[PDB]
Amino acid sequence: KLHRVFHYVLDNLVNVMNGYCLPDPFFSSKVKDWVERLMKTLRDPSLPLLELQDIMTSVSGRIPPNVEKSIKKEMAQYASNITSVLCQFPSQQIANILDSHAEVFFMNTQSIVQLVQRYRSGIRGHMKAVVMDLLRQYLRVETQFQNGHYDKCVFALREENKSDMNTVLNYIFSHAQVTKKNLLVTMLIDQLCGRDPTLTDELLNILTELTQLSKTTNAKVALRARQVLIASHLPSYELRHNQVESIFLSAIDMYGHQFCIENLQKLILSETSIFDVLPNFFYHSNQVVRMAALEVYVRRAYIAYELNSVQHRQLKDNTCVVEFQFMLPTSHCQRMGGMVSFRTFEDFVRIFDEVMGCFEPIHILNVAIKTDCDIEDDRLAAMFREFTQQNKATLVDHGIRRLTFLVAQFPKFFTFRARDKFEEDRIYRHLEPALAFQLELNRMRNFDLTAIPCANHKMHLYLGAAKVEVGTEVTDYRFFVRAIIRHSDLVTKEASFEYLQNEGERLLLEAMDELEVAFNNTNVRTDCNHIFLNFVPTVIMDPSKIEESVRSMVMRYGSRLWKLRVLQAELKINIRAIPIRLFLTNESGYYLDISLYKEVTAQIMFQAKQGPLHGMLINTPYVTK
Amino acid sequence: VQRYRSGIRGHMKAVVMDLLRQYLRVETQFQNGHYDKCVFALREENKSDMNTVLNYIFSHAQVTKKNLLVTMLIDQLCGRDPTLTDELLNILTELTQLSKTTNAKVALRARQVLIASHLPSYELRHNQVESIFLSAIDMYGHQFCIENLQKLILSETSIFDVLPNFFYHSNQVVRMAALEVYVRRAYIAYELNSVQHRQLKDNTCV
């Protein structure tokens, strides 16, 4: 019966994507049932047996009983023993034996050797094959289809093959129901490529061909193509919850390995961001790894500045609070800190009174909470605000510089800065001002800015609307993208140069993935796109090999720049230690001037060489050309 | 600073290690032949003076106190430390050869500890297998999983415990898989021609 489920559902589906779909409501039902029936019979490991059944019924004669009872015995074994999760049919064995007792018979039993040849890489051999085929099937047709414009392409089809038009009529009908083909392709993609971290570098070639598809209809396909194509590059979510679990409990149950500290510096100088998963366990139950993990989160947030004192507290209804004491390295002098891990806001309201019991306001205090409830961020934080205005008693208790609330599952931050400032801060809502001087966020104060949530949270993307007065309506709409890079350091002997090229290229591909998402999404005409890079290592390379490195990069990408139309990039990187703020200057055309400065006292001043825009201060709001 | 290079357990290693050689040296010269001749070998090892000898004689005189207490010391530091450092075990393997009724408790604690300091790490390999299974199992979409199960079924490492914490974890694939890996790894000697998973009315897999 499954054999019929197969031919029926498959012919229907290849007919789906041949164009024969009818534009009516029933489509969304018919194809949906059809598709699940496919997938289900595709997981069901009785397909290959039933098709070699079906051929082996039609070659009942001409038969050597040795090879038939051999293949048929051991399939029977496979059928009884199929309730194991990992059993596949003796493919290679049957091929060898057939080739041994074999060519009249060979030319009567050909269909099986080609069946087994399709069937060598398993039932997920098929899961590869079918979608891969469909992909180039879709691909050739719809890539030739919009290789310029509909008319010219159809006229080139007419004259390249003037003699016949049947391919043309099936073509015209098919891309007539293109949106149906295309939507349903997304559907198929969604429930296979929608969640599969493993993928074999054989498909991705076709996918990178597939991403270039340039039309309004192929815009879902484009965002899924990219989101999937990257997805593999941040896998194993619960796996790294397991790896950090291991590192912490093993390293810490003795906390004297001496290699624990080496792993801890790899934890606090890990290029991969673990602010995703780290919150789920730093409120597990073992007070030491609690403490360690929690302060490691602090240390990894404001990791940029220098800390000269850190004391662990352990207080009444037991709860461990840490206190910090540090100072600024020239941001704009000293301050302390507090981290507290709490389970629910209710409890916070109860155990309040000892938290300021054991506490110019010079304290930073950030509290991590779970928040798998009170789903509305606005009733949520609104309550939080009127908690501050009901009890500023915290402020009466020797004052706090800032109180940030961290609500967990990318955690939504809720920053409340105020002794005389207005309380809740909106420029910084949904983010923790860790690196905040670094993201020079006052240099965009001439703007109305919208926090956009985004994957790969390393990569923070900002939307800029030129803020103008009521008298006139805005002309500029620029994408700013500011990223973060949290690496340890690099040793010399030219290790850095290769690193710069490879990491820059990878990050740049991520950046164009983002601006691509920006095009696909609603898009409006950006002019002066921004790239922000914080290199936190300290290489000893030269400035002029930095200039060749940025030369090789920018030169390497040509048209690509002009399509995404990226106009501004800034880095710093400390070398021998001096700082060098490189700011890139390119207008229409690919001609580019590189601006290198110096930071000099008394309000610090970017000063070149000779560099354009020599003399200005640092909080320069962004020109709205 | 010279004691202080290898840390706070730089000290817990170092001091006891010294004490160990103190015990070791004394009682190794003590037993080689028989008590009298050995004391005569002491006469000639330090022919000129015998004060070291008298302190020696005094020390192994109250051996049983020393001996119990050596066991004690090992017990409340090396009583549990599968973390092993390539500096003690040399002295310890010297220590294992000690061949007398008096030096008879020390041998089983020294060795039994020194052995459980070998490969297993029960909760560590429960963690490694935790990884293998959960990593392998969200879609079993690896294909190299089969290669790792054949490494389990042709595994040098012993795995034979019961693993109660996951063997009733309620996820139908790891249910089925784990149970049959137990079957297969039990009855590995014979030839298998058929295996069916069943599924009672509620939620138990046979």
| DSSP output for A313-339 | --BTTTB-EEEEEEE-SS---EEEEEE
Burial code (b: 16+ CB inside 10 Å, e: under 16) for A530-539 equals bbbbbbbbeb
Tokens 């490492």 correspond to what residue? B157
DSSP 8-state symbol, A517: H
Coil, strand, or helix at residue A592? strand
- B51-61 helix and B63-78 helix, angle to the nearest 10 degrees: 70
| DSSP output for A88-128 | ---HHHHHHHHHHH--TTTTTS-HHHHHHHHHTT-HHHHHH
Chain A contact probe: residue of B126, B131, B144, B187 with most A CBs at under 10 A: B131
- Cα separation, B122 vs A70, in Å, equals 45
User: Cβ-count burial of B63 within 10 angstroms (0-12 exposed, 13-18 middle, 19+ buried)?
Assistant: middle
- Cα separation, A82 vs A76, in Å, equals 10
What are the two backbone dihedrals, phi and then psi, of residue A81, each rounded to the nearest 5 degrees? -95, 10
As beta bridge partners, residue A585 has A593
- A166-176 helix and A178-190 helix, angle to the nearest 10 degrees: 70
Going by C-beta distance under 8 Å and a sequence separation of 6 or more, which residues neighbour residue B86?
none
User: Cβ-count burial of B27 within 10 angstroms (0-12 exposed, 13-18 middle, 19+ buried)?
Assistant: buried
- Cα separation, A618 vs A437, in Å, equals 11
Beta-carbon separation of A256 and B141 below 8 A: no
Give the Å distances, CA to CA, from A549 to A240, A498, A581.
Answer: 34, 9, 15
Are A411 and A279 contacting, i.e. CB atoms less than 8 angstroms apart? yes
When CB atoms are compared, the residue of A84, A196, A242 closest to B180 is A84
Tell me the CB-side half-sphere exposure of residue A306, using CA atoms within 13 A: 8
In chain B, residues with a C-beta closer than 8 Å to the C-beta of A86 are: 140, 145-146, 149
Question: Which of these, A181, A89, A92, A76, lies nearest to A137 by C-alpha position?
Answer: A181
- Cα separation, A185 vs A131, in Å, equals 10
Question: Which of these, A261, A236, A235, A233, lies nearest to A247 by C-alpha position?
Answer: A261
Question: Which of these, A123, A459, A99, A591, lies nearest to B143 by C-alpha position?
Answer: A123
The CA R_g of chain B, rounded to the nearest whole Å, is 27
What are the two backbone dihedrals, phi and then psi, of residue A341, each rounded to the nearest 5 degrees? -100, 115
Beta-carbon separation of B135 and A236 below 8 A: yes
User: How far A192 CA lies from chain B's nearest CA (Å)?
Assistant: 11
Going by C-beta distance under 8 Å and a sequence separation of 6 or more, which residues neighbour residue A190?
A224
Beta-carbon separation of B177 and A238 below 8 A: no
- Cα separation, A20 vs A236, in Å, equals 41
Closest residue, chain B, to A250 (C-alpha):
B124
Tokens of residue A130, six digits: 């079918």
**CB contact, 8 Å: B108 with chain A?**
no
Question: Which of these, B11, B196, B67, lies nearest to A78 by C-alpha position?
Answer: B196
In chain B, residues with a C-beta closer than 8 Å to the C-beta of A84 are: 180, 195
**CB contact, 8 Å: A202 with chain B?**
no
B130-139: long-range pairs with CB below 8 Å, 24+: B130/A242, B130/B166, B131/A239, B131/A242, B131/A243, B133/B166, B133/B174, B133/B178, B134/A238, B134/A239, B134/A242, B135/A236, B135/A239, B135/A242, B137/B171, B137/B173, B137/B174, B137/B177, B139/A195, B139/A196
User: How far A1 CA lies from chain B's nearest CA (Å)?
Assistant: 22
Tokens of residue A489, six digits: 């350091």
Q: Where are the beta strands (DSSP E) in A398-458?
A: 402-407, 412-417, 447-451
Beta-carbon separation of A86 and B7 below 8 A: no
Beta-carbon separation of B83 and A198 below 8 A: no
- Cα separation, B181 vs B159, in Å, equals 11
Instruction: Give the method of determination.
Output: cryo-EM
Neighbours of A298 (CB within 10 A): 20
Are A16 and A184 contacting, i.e. CB atoms less than 8 angstroms apart? yes
Written as one letter, the residue type at A436 is A
Neighbours of A597 (CB within 10 A): 19
Burial code (b: 16+ CB inside 10 Å, e: under 16) for A391-408 equals eeebeeeeebbbbbbbbe
Question: Cα–chain-centroid distance for residue A613?
Answer: 36
A362: left (phi over 0), alpha (psi -120 to 50) or beta: alpha
**CB contact, 8 Å: A272 with chain B?**
no
Chain B contact probe: residue of A81, A84, A258 with most B CBs at under 10 A: A84
Give the Å distances, CA to CA, from A291 to A155, A283, A294, A339, B100.
Answer: 71, 9, 5, 10, 49
Going by C-beta distance under 8 Å and a sequence separation of 6 or more, which residues neighbour residue A45?
A82, A123
**CB contact, 8 Å: B4 with chain A?**
no
Closest residue, chain A, to B134 (C-alpha):
A239
Beta-carbon separation of A86 and B149 below 8 A: yes
Torsion of CA A19, A22, A23, A26, to 10 degrees: -130
- Cα separation, A345 vs A294, in Å, equals 18
- Cα separation, A389 vs A393, in Å, equals 9
**CB contact, 8 Å: B149 with chain A?**
yes
Written as one letter, the residue type at A230 is I
- Cα separation, A395 vs A242, in Å, equals 41
Write the secondary structure of A218-286 as one string of H (helix), E (strand) and C (coil).
ECHHHHHHHHHHHHCCCCCHHHHHHHHHHHHHHHHHHCCCCHHHHHHHHHHCCCCCCCCCHHHHCCCCC
Beta-carbon separation of B9 and A238 below 8 A: no
User: How far A249 CA lies from chain B's nearest CA (Å)?
Assistant: 10
Coil, strand, or helix at residue A83? coil
Beta-carbon separation of A81 and B6 below 8 A: no
Strands A402-407 and A364-369: parallel
When CB atoms are compared, the residue of B141, B176, B196 closest to A85 is B176
Coil, strand, or helix at residue B173? helix
Question: Cα–chain-centroid distance for residue A190?
Answer: 16
Beta-carbon separation of A80 and B124 below 8 A: no
Closest residue, chain A, to B192 (C-alpha):
A81
Question: Which of these, A411, A397, A325, A326, lies nearest to A368 by C-alpha position?
Answer: A411
Beta-carbon separation of B6 and A258 below 8 A: yes
What are the two backbone dihedrals, phi and then psi, of residue A507, each rounded to the nearest 5 degrees? -65, -40
Are A345 and A382 contacting, i.e. CB atoms less than 8 angstroms apart? no
- Cα separation, A143 vs A275, in Å, equals 41
Are A330 and A305 contacting, i.e. CB atoms less than 8 angstroms apart? no
User: Cβ-count burial of A529 within 10 angstroms (0-12 exposed, 13-18 middle, 19+ buried)?
Assistant: buried
Are A407 and A369 contacting, i.e. CB atoms less than 8 angstroms apart? yes
**CB contact, 8 Å: B172 with chain A?**
no
Chain B contact probe: residue of A43, A75, A80, A86 with most B CBs at under 10 A: A86
Element of type H or E holding A55 = helix A47-58
Tell me the CB-side half-sphere exposure of residue B52, using CA atoms within 13 A: 13
Tokens of residue A187, six digits: 């559907």
Neighbours of B70 (CB within 10 A): 22
The CA R_g of chain A, rounded to the nearest whole Å, is 31
Question: Which of these, A537, A545, A605, lies nearest to A572 by C-alpha position?
Answer: A537
When CB atoms are compared, the residue of A86, A198, A257 closest to B141 is A198
- Cα separation, A594 vs A571, in Å, equals 11
Going by C-beta distance under 8 Å and a sequence separation of 6 or more, which residues neighbour residue A417?
A401, A402, A403, A423, A425
User: How far B146 CA lies from chain A's nearest CA (Å)?
Assistant: 7
Are A466 and A514 contacting, i.e. CB atoms less than 8 angstroms apart? no
As beta bridge partners, residue A364 has A402
Tell me the CB-side half-sphere exposure of residue A552, using CA atoms within 13 A: 12
Closest residue, chain A, to B13 (C-alpha):
A256
- Cα separation, A115 vs A48, in Å, equals 9
Coil, strand, or helix at residue A155? helix
| DSSP output for A132-144 | HHHHHHHHHHHHH
Give the N- to C-terminal CA distance of chain B in Å, as an integer: 64
Question: Which of these, A162, A107, A127, lies nearest to A40 by C-alpha position?
Answer: A127
**CB contact, 8 Å: B206 with chain A?**
no
Give the N- to C-terminal CA distance of chain A in Å, as an integer: 69
User: How far B76 CA lies from chain A's nearest CA (Å)?
Assistant: 14
Tokens of residue A100, six digits: 């041994």
- Cα separation, B173 vs B135, in Å, equals 13
Strands A477-483 and A459-466: antiparallel
**CB contact, 8 Å: A578 with chain B?**
no
Coil, strand, or helix at residue B66? helix
**CB contact, 8 Å: B173 with chain A?**
yes
Tokens of residue A599, six digits: 């930071």
When CB atoms are compared, the residue of A81, A85, A239 closest to B177 is A85
Neighbours of A107 (CB within 10 A): 7
In chain A, residues with a C-beta closer than 8 Å to the C-beta of B197 are: 83
- B122-136 helix and A237-254 helix, angle to the nearest 10 degrees: 170
Going by C-beta distance under 8 Å and a sequence separation of 6 or more, which residues neighbour residue A396?
none
Written as one letter, the residue type at B156 is E
- Cα separation, A5 vs A3, in Å, equals 5
**CB contact, 8 Å: A232 with chain B?**
no
Coil, strand, or helix at residue A572? strand
Question: Which of these, A603, A546, A592, lies nearest to A567 by C-alpha position?
Answer: A592
Beta-carbon separation of B140 and A85 below 8 A: yes
In chain B, residues with a C-beta closer than 8 Å to the C-beta of A122 are: 143
In chain B, residues with a C-beta closer than 8 Å to the C-beta of A286 are: none
User: How far B28 CA lies from chain A's nearest CA (Å)?
Assistant: 32
This structure's resolution (Å) is 5.4
- Cα separation, B60 vs B69, in Å, equals 13
What are the two backbone dihedrals, phi and then psi, of residue A315, each rounded to the nearest 5 degrees? -135, 175
Beta-carbon separation of B141 and A196 below 8 A: yes
Question: Which of these, A504, A584, A599, A488, lies nearest to A539 by C-alpha position?
Answer: A488
In chain A, residues with a C-beta closer than 8 Å to the C-beta of B127 are: 242, 245-246
